[PDB]
Structure formats: C-alpha cells, structure tokens
Design a binder for this molecule. Structure first.
Ligand SMILES: [As]
Ligand SMILES: [As]
Ligand SMILES: [As]
Ligand SMILES: [As]
Ligand SMILES: [Zn+2]
Ligand SMILES: [Zn+2]
Ligand SMILES: [Zn+2]
Ligand SMILES: [Zn+2]
Ligand SMILES: [Zn+2]
Ligand SMILES: [Zn+2]
Ligand SMILES: [Zn+2]
Ligand SMILES: [Zn+2]
Lengths: 333, 333, 333, 333
C-alpha cells in the first residue's frame, strides 16, 4: 500500500533537529522537485516546495527533523557523554546501537550504556582515550542517531526509527505526486526543528502567509496491553486521525467537521483525535500574523520517540487520500 | 585586561527587569553614544545603537536587566514581603544586605531573612510599622536588588552582582569602541526583560529585521569542587564560549563553525558550549519574522544568579576580540 | 586479529538454551569437523569434537547456547507475552527489535515494549488477533532472540549479540585449527544449556571422564564510567583473563599459576580474574565423578547479557594463544 | 472418570519428605505389585516397580513425599514449635487442624495458630506442659500433616491434601494397570524427597540408567479471579499439561512435539506448559550420568501447597491416557 523504497529513503536519512541538512534535506528536495514548480530552502533550513495554484494559498507541513543525541564531553578513557536533541527517554538508549555522525554521509558505530537518567548515560565507540576518540572524528557537538532500519511487521505494519515525523514527510511526497490541477496555491513544507519548539513551522508560515494551514504528524496509538480503553487515543489500522485538539492547538471546528465529511463522502477510514499533552507544527502555523485557520491529520503510531516506532500502511494511505481530497476541494471551503 | 572603571559603572547601576530605565539604561546610552551614529530607545525600553554600515545588517544583543525582588506586601510591623523578578533562589537572599529603591538614584538598606521558600522570606528595613515603612518611601511595587559591589579575586578574576548579563553589556560597549569601518550595518542592542522571557530581544529584532543575529550572555562555569568533569559545562580562563545549543536555540551550524575557525585563525582562546536547560536572547532573535541565522558567544561565569557571580578577564577579552573579528569578516559569510 | 567472517557466522546463528539445534549446532559441526578425528552430538545436544591424542585426556568447553525469550501466551489482540531463557534483564528488551523464530532458518520481526519487569513486557509482531499471530507461525513455546549483528567499534573492538559465549565458541574453533600434534587426547566440547544451570557441561564431562578440564567463557569488564577501580574486574585489551575463582568454582591453584607462567614465558598478555557472583561450565566439569582439576580462561566483555556486548580482539587472540600453548604443554603438568 | 477409592487411599496416607515409609510407601507397593514383574525399595526409600520390556528403557517418576511440618521444640506449657518440610506457607497453617504422627498409623490432633512467619507459629495439642506432651508421644522430630480428606467439588473436580504429587502417584498406578505388552522396558518409580531437592529422582535414575525419562507432577492452574490471562499458566479441565520448560528443566523439544502429536492423533485434550519458577523430578533425571532425554506431563492444580488443592478428573484421565500412549509408541521414537 505504500512505496516501501521511498519510505526507506526518508526514514534512514540522518537529520536531527538543527542538522537536517546532513541528509534528510537533500532526500526531500530530490524526491519532490519534479512534482512542483519551485523548491527553495529558507534561512533556518525549511524546504519549501511550491505547486502554483488556482485558489486559496495552503501550507501543508511535515517536520523533517528527528530526535537524537549530541556529544557534550569526551571522557579520559574515550567514552562519550551526551545531551538529548528533542524529547529522548534514557530508557530507550540502554543496550542500543547508534550511528555517530562524524561527517556528512559518514558514521561510526556506538553503544549506549548504563532506570537511568542522563548523568548515568554514556556511549562507547571503541576508543581507549579522548585523543583516540578525537582522531576517530568525534568532538563536542557531534550528533548521534539510533542505528535503526525500516522493516515489515506482519501484513500491514512496519517498524522504524523516526516515523515521527518521517512518515509525514513520506505522506506529503505522495500527496505532491498525486495532486493534479488543484484549485489552490500549494506550499509543501518540510519544516526544521519541530522537536525542540515548532521553530521551523513558525518562520516558514510567516514567510508564506497562507490562507489555510495543515500539518501532518504522528499521534499516539496506545492500543497496547495494559492500557485502559479510554486512554488508547487512536488505533492502528482504523484510519487517518483528524485532530480536534492537542496542547498546542484547537483545530478550527469548521475545518475539523469539513475533513470528517470529506472522509465520509470518499469512504476514507478515519478516527477523531484528542491529546491531553502533545505538540504539532499546527500549533505555530495557526498563530502566524493575524491568524490562520488550520487542521491536522495524523498517522497513528505506537512506541513514539524510540528506535522502534510502529505504523499501519492502511492509516498512511488514508492520510494521503484525505489530504489529497482536501486540497482538491478546499476552494469550496 | 578589562576597563575596570567602566565595568564597575555597568554592574552597579540598578536595572531589574521592566525597570531598566531606573539606572542601567542611561549608563548604556552615555557610554555608547559617541561610538555610533544614532541611539534610540524603543517602546519596551530597549536601547538600540546604530553604527551605519557597509554590508549585512547584524544585530548584537546583550540584556541589560538583572534579577531582583519586588515588594508585594508591607506587614503590620514594617517588614516587607517580596516576589522574585526573574529566576531568584531563596537560598541567596538569607542574611544578605539589599538596596531598596525608593526613587531613581535613591535607596535605603534592607536585610533579607528566615532551606526557605518565598512564604518564609521577608526583608527588614528598620521600620516599626507599615506606616513608617510607607513614610520611608516603600510601597507595593518597590524594586530591590542585592547590595553588591565589583571586587577583584586574584590575578584574573572578579566577583560582582549582575555579571549576567552586565558583563555582556560591557562587552558590546568594548566592541563598539573597537569596531572600525566594518563591512556591516551594525545594531548594538541592550535588551530589556530577558530574565522573564526574552521579551526585549523579541520586539527589538522584529523592528530591526537583521540578516544575522548574535547574542552575548553568560554561560554556566561549574568547574568547582564536587562537580563531575562532564557536567562542568565551561571553565573559567579557557576562552570565550561559542554556543552550539541550549534549550532556547540551536545555533546555526555554519555560524558556529565559522566562529570556531575565526578563533583559530586569530589565536583567540575558545571553548564549545552545550546547555541542557537554559535560555538566551538568541532564542528570540532567530525566530523573528521569516527567520534569522544566529550565533551566540558567552562569558563563562560561576555562581550565576546571586550577589557573588565570578568571571575571568581572559574570557571577557576573548569574547570582545572574537565578536569584533566576526563583525569585520561577516561580509564574507 | 580475528577471522571476522567466522565470528559473524557463530554469533548470528540462533541457538537459545535447549534449542541449540536450530542453528549454532550445525555451524559448529561444519567449522570444526575438518580439524578433528570425529564429531559426535550427545543426548542433550552437546557437540563433542575429538582430536585423538598422545597424552592426558583434556576437555575444553565453550557453551553454545545464548540467552533469549520464549512465548508464553498470545493475547487476544495478537501481542506476545514472554518468559526469559537464561538471565535476561527487562531493561534490555524495551524498544528493541527481535527475531521471532517460527521455524528452523525462518523468522519474523518483533518489537519489545513497555523500569519494567516481566508482567509489563510484551512483543508486537504486527498481528491484529491471536488467530493472525498463530497463522504467522507463532505458538506457545516459540523462541525469540534480539535482532543483533556483529559490527566493529574502533580499531580493536566489536559489538554483537551473544558474545557470551559465542566468542568462546570462536576461540575453540580457532584453537582446533592451530593445534598440531599435541601431546594430549583432546575433546573440544560446544556445550548446551550453560545459561540455565551448566547442564550440558555436566553430562558431557561425565561421558568424557577427562584428566583435566578447561572452560572458556566471557568475564565481566566493568572498566566503564562511574565504576570504582576495585570493581572493574577486568579491562578490555589488557589480555586473556585467567580465572582464580567465581561463585561456581575455585580453579586448581596449580593450574592457575601454571597458566600464568605459560603466559609470561610466551609473552601473552593476561590478567587475573575473581568474580563474587557468577558461573561457568568449569563449575560442573570439576565436580565430575571423582573430581577433575580445572582451569578457565575468559574473554573480558562489557555489557554482558544484552544485544550490545563488546569485546577486544587483542584479548580474544591472547585467549586462543594461551589455550593452544596449554594444550601443547599439558603433558608436562 | 477416576477410581475414587484408590485416589482416596493415596492422598490420605501419610508420607512427608524423608518419612514416606510411614504410610504412602506401603500403599504404593500394595497397589502396583500385581501389575509389574518386580518391586524394590532402594536405599533412600524410592519404590521401583519394573515391568520387563521389549524395547527402550523408560523411567516414569511421580514423587510420593508431601509437604508437612516437624516439631523443633516443646514449650513449657505444652505448645509445639515447628519447621517446614518442603515449601510450606505460614498463611496455610493458621486456624487449621493437623494430624500429629506419634507412631506409624497413630496420630493425635493438633491446632495451628497465631500475616505470620515461623517465629509466631505454634501447634496446640491440648497438653498443659512439656512433660504431658511428651507422655502423649511427641518429641523433637515428630512429623505433622494437615488433617485433610478427599472430597468432590461439583461434577468433575476434587479437593484434597497432597494432590501434589499424589495425583501423579495415582496416575502411574493407573498407567501400570492399563499398560499391556508395551515395546519398552518400564520402570515406574515413586520417588522420595522431591519437595526438598529432587533427591530421590536423582539416586533412582542413577541406578536405573534409563534411555528416556518422564516425570508426572502437578502444574499451577491459576485460572482464578484476579489473575491476568497471561499469568494463569494452565486451566482446569482443558487437558493434561505437556511441559516445555520450568526452572529445573527444558524438556527435549523432540519429545515435547512428539507428545503433542500423539495427543492430537488419539484425540487427548492437552495444553502446553511454561513455568518461570518451579521444579520437577525431570530436573534431576535428565542430568543423570551422560544425560537422559526427558519429558513431563502435569496435572493442572489450583491452590498448590495447601490442605485444599483442587484438580479436574478430565485432566487426570488425559494424563493417564497420554502417558499410556507414549509408552506404547516410544519404541518408534
Ligand atoms: As510530536
Ligand atoms: As540567562
Ligand atoms: As556466564
Ligand atoms: As512441585
Ligand atoms: Zn512529530
Ligand atoms: Zn516527536
Ligand atoms: Zn543572561
Ligand atoms: Zn540570568
Ligand atoms: Zn557464558
Ligand atoms: Zn551468560
Ligand atoms: Zn510435585
Ligand atoms: Zn510441591
């Protein structure tokens, strides 16, 4: 149901917050350029792909940064100390393998070690001294990501690093490929630094000044053992999630019901989403200048913020389909 | 290595957040006006000093507000109750002397008393009743700062109140004096209300709309007894600190390595800085309008947010030197 | 320094306790058969490789079983519940990828999830129901291992799943290849079920009735950050570890000093090992029948019992060299 | 479905660990002798019943010892202090009636009293002094069992003392009665001291030196209120339990699947069993000499180690049937 090869390209490219230029940026440009009229990279690094249109100016954002680690200190015996880039949980770093980025397109392996908190965490790269670690290419500021790869789980699911929000990057790339003569002036934006404060969404939206804003991200799917039914949020395979509200935004009620009606009419599976504590690029877009009516579609995902995030292709397909239909009909809104 | 008299003038002028006009504002205007083309004070009180230039528009910000206290209630027996202005720790108020500002350029002494939290803290000014305290010039809203003075510690260090961020104010005043025919349109800004939310940096940056932004502040130097080596952050005397990231900003990687290369070329001592939880004016500047590439240089400082902050003149000199070199070469960036 | 390809073959073959026949058994037989006179597999599954000799009967054992998990229940929504095979720590299962063995040479992926203990742990294989999980080939008793691969760390180190005790299996395979006309009747034994009670070592030793016994295993290398010097046990790269005693055995003092003297004479790096709480096959071998004088050589290893165990090739080489020298000179003991 | 009278005879005969000769031993000999060729009692007290056969030597063991108490001290006022024989839980001794064995076939009643642990537990036998208690026949070393009797619970269940492992003793007696011209040399063994360390199974297996070993015991049935589905282990009435592994043994996988296939072919209800922490005679048998391939069939039982253990006759019948079929077909294995 999804273009596996394309998905693999987007989830495995390195791109931690602030350092998206190290890999994901180029993948996005290369995969979207032939489907739009112009592609630009702004000051903070956001990739803005414009598909000239016949109607309302619409911004569709998916963040391309992923969570990761940054080297803060190199111990005398060569071990590395780190600080999180984004919301990283120490429990997900123990006895894990990492890709320590020493240069663009070049990494060395590392092992995370020693319920822990940051002061007990360290990375082992096989060095015997600080000098050897430095000779290997490591320094203060070196970025690190988990060593994770995309794999299939059963008939319709997948496991991978950075499904948040790379599955959304995949989604807008697919939407850009499907969109044909839409009555709208579309700006597809792969935003930077969402994981540290919705920073890229804020600056790109200011420059674009859209009439409507849409964000695509992942939402919690806690449909797992031991979770009370009312706390599952969303279920894998039950459809794209239309956001009603999260801690950063209350989606425009008119857009929310409009999307729901579109899903019903085109027979696209969907589910309604409410989060008590979360954040999305929509949270920045809607507060741009004099205000922007916004909506958000999410891909349900289990185990968010780890090297083993899980999604269902049926929800991914529903998201691509609903966003495409929204763009084709937004001129009537 | 530093102009002691000038430093004394800037650290001892009163200027708590929101009330910078009571003292520090005028010191800044008087000390910088002869080195720039025009000096303005905007709506929130930011001092903007423009040195007309031949190149990129660059904003350099140092906040002039300091942390302090505000009187919230006067007890029946004349004692004062207070609320913090900025991040003040109760442990730093016990058995301390204070300057209770009753008017511009006029203060009376006070003694802080009674591990405490705010509900146990009170200030004694020698009054016997609420009426006597009011007759002495105190009222709800009266601002208070520690009674601290600048003094030398050994060969290269100093102790003082408000080194954060007055040492940065000193730094930009020194940079303005050294800058000669720079290929850049420079805006030196002494910002207000940084300690309560980077408020002045936000509004001044919006009005200036710079091409590049640089903030100068202090960074944690925890190179003291009992601190694990990997948690010291920076070391006094080891150089100006080039920020890679803190909780409010991920400095543009191109600017970060550019500054590092400049330091190497001109033989200026420097160290790389990463903070897990902090905030700087750069955090506001870079998110201005469509975005602004930014960098930050910091002066390592021990015991931040107290009446006994400590810095090393060698780091201060390195900061002045690196910022000056950056401004002289930014046109090539 | 090590035969990387051979090591990769031994660490990546599946073989949890009791189920060594699923993979590792055949790798061992295939890689050792051409270097010995006869190869047999006994009742519990131990592989016994006999190199007919001219002297004392010597048994050299390395266990081929690795720790893992076994499916105990399949939940209504397709999730799997597990029980440990060997000493598995729940902290090493969270947000990890696994290979769920549905048949010999056939696996499907799984994700471990939800400080935890066994009642909170579960594996997600992408199934939507118990029936779908069963159709995928899973049942009560299905065995599972981490999805780990051998990789290099720096100049001399490696990271891998099951270095305990696969690095010892590699070692005896290398010793069997090097041993030439030794004055001893040698029995190389790849034992089963060491992780659950030194079970295979017990039964194979009874049948062999050796004059001398030697076990090769891994020992704790806690030469990592935060560990007091006296608690590091061994250091990576400092040599093969000659065991003095652990909780299961006090090595024969004559053999211990004999090995130390051999290491000194042949210039083989070594270190002395004492463990307060551990267990090795020697613990079973020495208590066989009327008793067997035994010794043990260990490969220092960090992060034991995880998917990211780390060893140093210099220690592996020293172990192969010392065991080879011991076999060539044991006739003089 | 079961021979009620025979079951009553086996569960009510006294026979705590080490003292099986006081009652159960003779019941076993009397009930099995006419179905075998020879019956012997070895040194530790194991009853070995040999049914001469035409094939593989097979040992089938069921332990005849039950948990109980032993008098450790007689207080000045006649109360008795005790120590457990086997894994006894103090909570099962409070406000309970006991049979204090003063001689073979002679007992007096006692009452257990005063969440408790051993130092608070005592038995009241109606004595007024230590001298009177001694005159009643009690001394240090006197053994005690609960005063429990076999009774029916509903249509298919029963409640009784010592179903562990007397229900297995009943099972082998029934198998011995059904076995006819089996192609195997069968040794039925009622083992001693299983509850204190699988001691009798170890010594009898050494003497028999079987080709195959099978143990019959009870397994946990926690299919009761408040137990999570994945922690129930087995369910009453769902069939004989084929053990995959417990803490003392990993059953030979070939035998496990062979038994499962036999159950399927003969339409005998069965369920697969995995225990995280338990122990069975198989744990000793399989490690005998050079090793013995073993399997174990268990009768699901609720409330194990109490005076109110509960089993289902349908599971007992399935166990007798599967063990009989295994013996008749083992020659093909
Ligand atoms: As998010
Ligand atoms: As600050
Ligand atoms: As071990
Ligand atoms: As038992
Ligand atoms: Zn996201
Ligand atoms: Zn996220
Ligand atoms: Zn500051
Ligand atoms: Zn501050
Ligand atoms: Zn081992
Ligand atoms: Zn182990
Ligand atoms: Zn039992
Ligand atoms: Zn028992």
């Amino acid at each position: 149901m999804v273009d596996y090869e394309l998905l693999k390209k987007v989830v495995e490219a390195p791109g931690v917050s602030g350092y998206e230029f190290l890999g994901i940026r180029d993948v996005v440009i290369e995969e979207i350029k032939d489907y739009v009229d112009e592609v630009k990279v702004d000051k903070l690094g956001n990739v803005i792909a414009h598909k000239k249109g016949e109607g309302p100016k619409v911004m569709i954002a998916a963040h391309m940064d992923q969570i990761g680690l940054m080297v803060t200190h190199i111990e005398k015996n060569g071990f590395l100390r780190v600080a999180p880039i984004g919301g990283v949980d120490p429990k997900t770093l123990i006895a894990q393998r990492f890709k320590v980025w020493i240069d663009k397109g070049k990494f060395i392996y590392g092992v995370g070690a020693s319920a822990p908190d940051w002061d007990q965490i360290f990375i082992d790269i096989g060095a015997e001294s600080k000098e050897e670690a430095e000779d290997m290419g490591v320094k203060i500021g070196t970025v690190i990501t988990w060593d994770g790869r995309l794999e299939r789980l059963g008939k319709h699911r997948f496991v991978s690093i950075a499904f948040d929000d790379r599955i959304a990057v995949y989604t807008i790339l697919e939407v850009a490929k499907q969109l044909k003569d839409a009555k709208a002036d579309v700006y597809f934006v792969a935003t930077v630094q969402e994981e540290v404060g919705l920073r890229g969404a804020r600056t790109s939206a200011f420059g674009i000044e859209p009439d409507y804003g849409f964000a695509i991200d992942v939402t919690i799917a806690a449909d797992i053992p031991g979770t009370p039914e009312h706390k599952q949020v969303t279920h894998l395979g039950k459809g794209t999630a239309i956001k009603i509200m999260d801690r950063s935004v209350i989606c425009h009620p008119t857009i929310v019901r409009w999307l729901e009606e579109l899903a019903k009419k085109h027979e696209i599976p969907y589910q309604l989403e409410i989060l008590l504590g979360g954040g999305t690029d929509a949270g920045a877009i809607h507060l741009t200048k004099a205000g922007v009516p916004t909506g958000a579609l999410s891909v349900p995902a289990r185990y968010i913020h780890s090297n083993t995030e899980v999604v269902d292709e049926r929800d991914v397909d529903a998201t691509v389909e609903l966003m495409t239909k929204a763009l084709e009909n937004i001129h009537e809104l």
